[PDB]
Amino acid sequence: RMQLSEEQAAVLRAVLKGQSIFFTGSAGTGKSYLLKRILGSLPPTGTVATASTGVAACHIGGTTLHAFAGIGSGQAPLAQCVALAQRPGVRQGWLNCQRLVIDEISMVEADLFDKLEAVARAVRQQNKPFGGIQLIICGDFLQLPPVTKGSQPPRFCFQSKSWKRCVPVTLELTKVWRQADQTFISLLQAVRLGRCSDEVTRQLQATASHKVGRDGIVATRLCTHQDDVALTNERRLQELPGKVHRFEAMDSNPELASTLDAQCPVSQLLQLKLGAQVMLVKNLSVSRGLVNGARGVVVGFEAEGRGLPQVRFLCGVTEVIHADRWTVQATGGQLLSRQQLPLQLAWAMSIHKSQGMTLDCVEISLGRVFASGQAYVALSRARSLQGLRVLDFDPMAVRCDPRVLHFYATLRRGRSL
Ligand SMILES: Nc1ncnc2c1ncn2[C@@H]1O[C@H](COP(=O)(O)OP(=O)(O)NP(=O)(O)O)[C@@H](O)[C@H]1O
Ligand SMILES: CC(=O)Nc1ccc(-c2csc(N)n2)cc1
Ligand SMILES: CC(=O)Nc1ccc(-c2csc(N)n2)cc1
Ligand SMILES: [Mg+2]
């Protein structure tokens, strides 16, 4: 285990003292890593690991907050949500939960937080904030903004009238680890706060000339919408001359495939060719650089058996990629599994799917208005400036929601620095 910073240790201390806490910090400050250390330090009984999204839940071995709550979409009236939470399996999960971990809190809208808080009280019959559950919450409100299952403009989670009562303590992680380069760290920090000076703008524009690929590997284009990702990956695959090689997943419940898809980074049908640009979506070997996010290209298929792909990675290593398995925790503690190769096509990927990840071979076009925090998320995935190529950069792409700046300014009002 790595040596926790003083900041990271302080959060761990609070959690083990039984304090409900929100902890926050820039991209790559080790929030999710610290969640893993927290989960290891707690009894597994009574501790529930969630995140706002399926992609983020994977990073910590958890489930989605949606799946844990078991209140359907959460759009139904509170009384109907309570009844849903009273269902077998669901109910027990609420009753037995003493500590609830939530990563990537920035995607949870205030109305949903309010709903969960009320459900917690109703189901557990405990007249205390959040049913008396110890909340352990982290993320960055200057990253991806709240989504909604409804049609109204969402409020940030901190706008809930229950936020401060439910998470009375706030701590910060301030040392970025993802990037090693101070120039790049300082550049990302300016973007995160919406402060694009002439110098910042010039620096990002200069990346347009970066050749980020090496030896037949090309940059993954980060896109705002999955439609555009799917179309790009399919068209680039189709244009390759080789025969198609197919790898069909085996699911424990094929019928529930769609529930699996939301919490699992691999598809039912994987199609590959010589030359296919692929991303490894599971940590295989940290030492050999075979980690989640690693980019490579298919350099052959084995002659024998299933004809598994041989993949040359940007790092250097060339390796035959074997089947792996994901076991997802759905509603009411139901478990579903998928066996598949841990590969996705990677000429393109959505910014939402990169949430929480480190990447190192990325291109993005930043000349349009984006959602608050979305340009920052995209840029802050890259380990290094030289693995990033930004096209058509314009500060219009970089927006911070004023509500979030006000939140952060209020949060630090009494602090030393
Ligand atoms: N104490 C530490 N010492 C050294 N490296 C660390 C430490 N804590 C975390 N890291 C590394 O920091 C990197 C980023 O960690 P991660 O947990 O993804 O950050 P994050 O704050 O969750 N990122 P994001 O989800 O993008 O906001 C990982 O490669 C960790 O190994
Ligand atoms: C839970 C979940 O859906 N995870 C996930 C993560 C990454 C990707 C991915 C990588 S490259 C690409 N085109 N898409 C897809 C899915
Ligand atoms: C609760 C807390 O710690 N701070 C906080 C910050 C901002 C807002 C907000 C933005 S505009 C609006 N109507 N509400 C609410 C609360
Ligand atoms: Mg994270």
Numbering used by the authors: 204 to 620
Text taken from the publication that reported this structure:
PIF1 is a conserved 5′—3′ superfamily-1 (SF1B) RecD-like helicase found in most eukaryotes, prokaryotes and archaea. The ∼45 kDa hPIF1 HD (residues 206–620) has two well defined RecA domains (1A and 2A) containing the conserved helicase motifs required for ATP binding and hydrolysis. The 112 amino acids of domain 2B (residues 437–548) are contained in and covalently linked to domain 2A and contain the ‘rail β-hairpin’ implicated in DNA unwinding, that moves relative to a small ‘wedge’ (1B) region in domain 1A during nucleotide hydrolysis.
Using the previously reported starting conditions, hPIF1HD/AMP-PNP crystals were obtained and used for fragment soaking experiments with compounds from the well-developed XChem DSi-poised library (500 mM in DMSO), optimized for solubility and further chemical expansion. In the 1.73 Å resolution hPIF1HD/AMP-PNP/1 structure, the binding pose of compound 1 is well defined. In the hPIF1HD/AMP-PNP/1 structure, compound 1 is between domains 2A and 2B with Val 258 from domain 1A at one end of the binding site. The nitrogen of the 2-aminothiazole amine is hydrogen-bonded directly to the main chain carbonyl of Leu 548 and Ala 551, and via two waters to the side-chain of Asn 436. In hPIF1HD/AMP-PNP/1 there are no direct hydrogen bonds between amino acid side chains and 1, however, Val 258 from domain 1A is making van der Waals interaction (<3.8 Å) with the amide group at one end of the molecule. A significant feature of the binding of compound 1 in the hPIF1HD/AMP-PNP/1 structure is that the compound slightly enlarges the pocket by shifting the position of Pro 468.
